[PDB]
Amino acid sequence: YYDIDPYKEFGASVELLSFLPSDFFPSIRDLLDTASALYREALESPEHCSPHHTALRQAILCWGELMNLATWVGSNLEGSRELVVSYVNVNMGLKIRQLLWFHISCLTFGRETVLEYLVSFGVWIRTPPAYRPPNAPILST
Amino acid sequence: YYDIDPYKEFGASVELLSFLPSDFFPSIRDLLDTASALYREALESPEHCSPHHTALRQAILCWGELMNLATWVGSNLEGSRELVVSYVNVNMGLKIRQLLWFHISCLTFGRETVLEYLVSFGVWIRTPPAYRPPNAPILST
Amino acid sequence: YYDIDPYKEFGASVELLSFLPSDFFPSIRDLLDTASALYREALESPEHCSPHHTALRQAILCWGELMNLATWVGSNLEGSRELVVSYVNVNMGLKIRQLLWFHISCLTFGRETVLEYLVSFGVWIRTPPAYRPPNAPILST
Amino acid sequence: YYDIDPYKEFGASVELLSFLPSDFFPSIRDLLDTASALYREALESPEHCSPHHTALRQAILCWGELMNLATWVGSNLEGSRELVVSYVNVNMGLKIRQLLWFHISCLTFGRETVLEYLVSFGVWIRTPPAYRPPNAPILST
Amino acid sequence: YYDIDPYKEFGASVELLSFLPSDFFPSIRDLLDTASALYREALESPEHCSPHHTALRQAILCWGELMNLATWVGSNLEGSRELVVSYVNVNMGLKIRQLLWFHISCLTFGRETVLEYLVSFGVWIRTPPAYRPPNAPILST
Amino acid sequence: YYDIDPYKEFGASVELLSFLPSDFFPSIRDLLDTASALYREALESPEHCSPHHTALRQAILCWGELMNLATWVGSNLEGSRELVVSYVNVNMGLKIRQLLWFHISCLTFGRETVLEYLVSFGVWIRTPPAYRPPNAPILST
């Protein structure tokens, strides 16, 4: 097929978010726990809200799809058990984490507030370490 | 946290869509060509619209990633090539078809109208063949 | 005191429903799945509504009690298992089907509309096959 | 299937009424005679009234169903005559009596009046006999 | 400079008309007789009208010139007579048919109406034959 | 038979307090000591409304009965002395700690203030150590 960028509607791009390093994003288990903690009720009583909830729902569904596929592959055929599990998360399991991180953070700290955090992280990481402050510009309210 | 239904915000459950038989849904290629045909420009110039476009975007992404994974499996290790592809479509590829079928049909023929087609198909299939109307369930403007 | 017809309050007699053939009515399983599908929540949060919900409730109870009785007969004494079950559905199980068929169809397609379907089916079946419209009695919104 | 409680709409529960002992309810013949005595006319000229009449109609119909079944069982096959008759009434013939007792009493003495009688019976039966009055709190206008 | 689509000014693309199969379009003779039948006078007394008449005029000219060229090829040099004529209709003669089919149908049944017929035919052809409505796509006033 | 949580009446769930690590909560003795220090006059003397006081009283009484049961068991029958007490604190002693911690913190800093502390601590632990604020969040005025 051809390209498509989910973040265009929200006000970013897939490569604007590419500045952040791979190891920066939290573990997927923690992201799911945070999503279930203070947003379990909102996802079960859907009124006309932001598409963030919908995106979270499809992300969770396409990820449970991956869990079912991995369990199947481990259960019938044939690195028979772990190679596919170790392969799915490295290349593409990062994609789900990026979606969850953006949508969860946008809901709590607000829509616009995340954007200046992103550009501030971009200038921080581009400058050589000899001239940048040793602490990253962590976000808050 | 694996009991989430997507369609509830739109007005339908998962068992409501279980009236339709499995093989009724069209092929993935035809749906993709249709979406690229009369809805390509909408996905590239996104304004504040219904979550249908977002659902289509994540569906296309969650399909393409599976395509790449199938290519990797067929070209890297080990039924090395044909077993995995024959399983994805029958097991999980059906889910992608249901999303595209619902969202595309809801966009063109409307949100309200596509609901009566579901119940009308339900009564059509349950009646015995001896009094079944001969081959006339269909959707039109 | 055994001459009581239920449907008179709704607008129909028992012989009026005798136009339809015996085998036209759908199976009990399909009716139960339909009722659980698009009417489960109504039976659990009862406000002042039409007696249709009450009729459905006593119909479901009068069916489940027969199920328990059949289980008892098949598992306790003595055609010990299959004779009694083969008789309940053909003799009295038909009555439960007629109640569910009328009330469910009356709820969705309306009270007034379901009456013309009865007379329309009556004229369709009485005409000779030589001029009968080929296989097109059906109900829709 | 699953549970359902007919009395929720009326304002009680199946287990609220479970406080009353099994031998408290009148004989079914007397209940039918009382129903036919001062309510034969109301059941043959149905205007938009309380669902009590409908519930009585379906109860009478599902009970005549049982009479027909018992006569059949006694007439063709095979405790061949009385075991089924003695079994239907003990476990489930009580259910019809509970329906008839509630609906008949609610019509005569009023809707709300039956409720305080029920709770007053509950406190009376729970207290040990050493401290409760020897006479039960019988109901009236 | 060879990427130009004609139908965009009217409201349709080229791939939108690719839903229809190749052999669905009528013959050239029937279209010519129809145009001469109910539209001869319009092409001879031209006022300020829609570009449909102009499109028809250049289509007829671009067909007649090919007819003259085929006559020349068959009567001058060299499959001297039948090879070239058998190729023009199958290769490029189809394009003339598409123009006449669209413009003639748009003139009689209207500009807006002929668009829904395109999407309606699209959904009709993509569905599997097992649930396809039996042979009923058609256009009428 | 009965499954109910004691937190929904205030504005928090039971899973919300489960997101924090178990070892975060202080020891059982310190919580009782501070409760006696700050609310001995409040617990003994009745005050209007203030459900926190009633919940605290109930928790203290239940803890006392549990301790009395432990003393009775440890010196009567049979790990006769240490197995059960080492099992009490781990199994339901943790819940007692959560009850005391929530209400005492709610009484001092207010009901609304303790809520953002829960989520702020929740996200802080989930974020990677290299990018989180160097100091842990603490509860204060």
Residue numbers in the entry:
A (entry chain B), B (entry chain A), C (entry chain A), D (entry chain B), E (entry chain A), F (entry chain C): 49 to 126, 278 to 340
What does the article say, verbatim?
The N-terminal domain of HBcAg (aa 1–149) can form a dimer and be assembled into a capsid with an icosahedral symmetry composed of 180 (T = 3 state) or 240 (T = 4 state) subunits.
Each linker composed of 10 or more residues made the affibody flexible, and thus the structure of the affibody in HAF could not be clearly confirmed even though the molecular structure of HAF was obtained.
